Symmetry: D2
Subunit: 219 residues, 4 copies
Amino acid sequence: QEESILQDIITRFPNVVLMKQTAQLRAMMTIIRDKETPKEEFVFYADRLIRLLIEEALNELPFQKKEVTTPLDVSYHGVSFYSKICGVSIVRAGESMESGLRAVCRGVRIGKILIQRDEPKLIYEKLPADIRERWVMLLDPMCATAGSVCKAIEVLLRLGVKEERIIFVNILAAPQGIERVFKEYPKVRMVTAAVDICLNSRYYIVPGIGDFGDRYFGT
Amino acid sequence: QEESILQDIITRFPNVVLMKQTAQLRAMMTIIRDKETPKEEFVFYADRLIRLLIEEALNELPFQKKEVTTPLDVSYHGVSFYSKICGVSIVRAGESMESGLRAVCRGVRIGKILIQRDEPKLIYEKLPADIRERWVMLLDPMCATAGSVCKAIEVLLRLGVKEERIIFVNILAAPQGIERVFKEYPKVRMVTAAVDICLNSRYYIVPGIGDFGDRYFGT
Amino acid sequence: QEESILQDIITRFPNVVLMKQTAQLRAMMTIIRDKETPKEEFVFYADRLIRLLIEEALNELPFQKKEVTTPLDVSYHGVSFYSKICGVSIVRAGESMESGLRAVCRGVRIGKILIQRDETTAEPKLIYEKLPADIRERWVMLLDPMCATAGSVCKAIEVLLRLGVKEERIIFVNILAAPQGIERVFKEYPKVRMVTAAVDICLNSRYYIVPGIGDFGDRYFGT
Amino acid sequence: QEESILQDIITRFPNVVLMKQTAQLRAMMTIIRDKETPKEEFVFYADRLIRLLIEEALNELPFQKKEVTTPLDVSYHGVSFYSKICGVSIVRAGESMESGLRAVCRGVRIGKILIQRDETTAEPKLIYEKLPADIRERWVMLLDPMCATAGSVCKAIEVLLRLGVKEERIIFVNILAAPQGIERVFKEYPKVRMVTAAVDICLNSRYYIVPGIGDFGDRYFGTM
Ligand SMILES: O=P(O)(O)OC[C@H]1O[C@H](OP(=O)(O)OP(=O)(O)O)[C@H](O)[C@@H]1O
Ligand SMILES: O=c1cc[nH]c(=O)[nH]1
Ligand SMILES: O=c1cc[nH]c(=O)[nH]1
Ligand SMILES: O=c1cc[nH]c(=O)[nH]1
Ligand SMILES: O=c1cc[nH]c(=O)[nH]1
Ligand SMILES: [Mg+2]
């Protein structure tokens, strides 16, 4: 069944974070995996889900302690997040969740990477000039083979960024996809909403959702 | 000691669902609590904590099995929510949560109850004509003596709303505040983000966050 | 027809700012006026005009010239807006405009005023209110969707004045309005400003604005 | 003067739609023009401007008289909009306005076009593109905030024509632009409409609108 798959990657991969499979999440998923739903509903529930994913993501960033006084003039053991960060989206598929990040991390810096296969290739790219100094949120909705994401982490490591400081924010991923990215580059963080059975004769996830970018942008 | 409080309420008030005490959660609460944070920042974060509130609360709603097929012609076992809802906000304080509810529940019906101290007393109220046949998301940021939330429930109950069908959405709650609601109306459901240590002479929650109402608005 | 009505008040009350009757505007209206359009669909087009209306209301404030330097290293002869302000809504009707105002004006102060006609006397009566402590120093955006008899709106303007706010510093942000309602407010307190999206022609036996939309409060919040 | 330039490109280019210079508009422009303001303030005011921009461009669409009945049980003589539409954002700079378009036109389809000057030749060239397969039978809201020399926007219109898009069902949505940038699009493609919010005086050696605002994208994504 489904449980078996989940449990295995959890036990076999410490740096991967699975969101709590709350009913309201299953629900959102069915609504987007279903091929019937209109384009209007797909982006809404997508967004509605993206956001819930980014929050469970910003939970991997380092935080320090910080005391504060309440209006009632009494202290509180609050916490705080320093660390400069930025968002990096894999062209089109990733741009999906950019808006979801700027909703919670105002005026956050956005970087773009166009990984095109004709071995995956690099095409266009604009990143923060100080990307090496910050923590990176790697945005890619679907993780099928992990070839473009593994090409993304590759261009990033060559530019400086520390592997231990990458946080792959994803929605759907295949077991073969998550174990390759973790074989190629351990020490990275992965946060997803769901992991499926396997790959298609082609390279699509099963059950899957289809082609995210196409369904998200209307093409 | 703030660890022991959550323990008593957890095992003696089974209907209370406390959000997961995460680093990011504490971080938001840290800033909303701080009396140093200005207008602009107070709401932005408050709006973000609320958003994760309305979500978590939505898992209290009943759902059924639903199947659909992905664009790969393989079926998927998901779920869906029926039984329509509505949102009742205790005027001014809970109105701050309306925008969050309608951000996950497009066009959901909204009700308003304005309870005033004379003994809390009803002053004005406009609920959906339907109401008595729906699930009710009761909005109220602060719950110190629970005096107002109780008056808000004895008024909904007088309108034919099923006790077990009332989900109380709260941000900050005081121990004595809980014991009151679950004593007068033991079948309601409560979802809070933070449970505090105690109230003071002016019946404010401490540490607390002050008067959520005018802090969210213009003092 | 409509153009003989819009022109008359334009001439008779130079203090009201009618919005530009565009195709997109006219289109929105008919969508929300249609007794058919479903709830979720009525609020979408609602909050979409609420925003276009507020953006038109912000040009009623005072501004000062402001020169800036651009990345090309040159100067720009710009302007800028000072003048503290705040929003004040008429409970359950204007509230539908808060969040809109809060969208172009991050964390703007919002005050509430619940007015109520009497069950017998049909008399505008104050029920509740919470305005900013210094509401007299700031400029005010009075929010209220409908304006038929203008009964409540004049009472709301009344409590504000008797609190230090300057009449000529009150700006009336409204969606719909009938000739009588805007003849009365401008007869009562002549210096306020009013920005409306549209002015119908008359009211019916129930004092409702006829081409109208019905009950903006119930239609927006559902209920 | 200024009223001189603007008056000219208004009378010799009937298809340009110069947003009404409201104070609040002058206000915003100022803030997004200050090399002094922070990232977050720039996006906030840019977005707010964009949304206003898009709401003006939608009126370049065709409507049709329609009646409806008011809850007061009486008719209203309104208008309605059909003619399906999509949005085509030139990669990066144009993307900024995307969310703005989806804020008013829910679920709308979006096609991207990544044009880029050549290594040595220095002329525009197509590199990547993903548009709606149906794009030939719909109106196109082309998204590009800047209109310098118009080399990129023209190379955009070109690919849309090669796909069967009518050059009159093309609404060019832009914020700030240069007179020679306008001159260029209205030479190659005279039937495309262009609604903009600002028209400066000239362009410099780097090909930047002189008063201008610098590198829009660079500043919008914070990659400078
Ligand atoms: O009409 P033109 O003469 O081409 O001038 C304006 C175009 O060029 C700029 O792109 P820029 O290279 O500054 O790159 P980026 O914004 O995508 O980073 C601008 O964003 C428009 O796309
Ligand atoms: O969008 C995509 C890309 C690859 N595989 C999928 O299932 N979806
Ligand atoms: O502490 C409290 C109690 C009630 N309402 C508030 O805003 N704060
Ligand atoms: O038509 C009318 C008149 C007053 N108030 C409303 O909500 N509608
Ligand atoms: O005006 C200009 C010139 C170059 N690049 C931009 O983004 N804008
Ligand atoms: Mg660009």
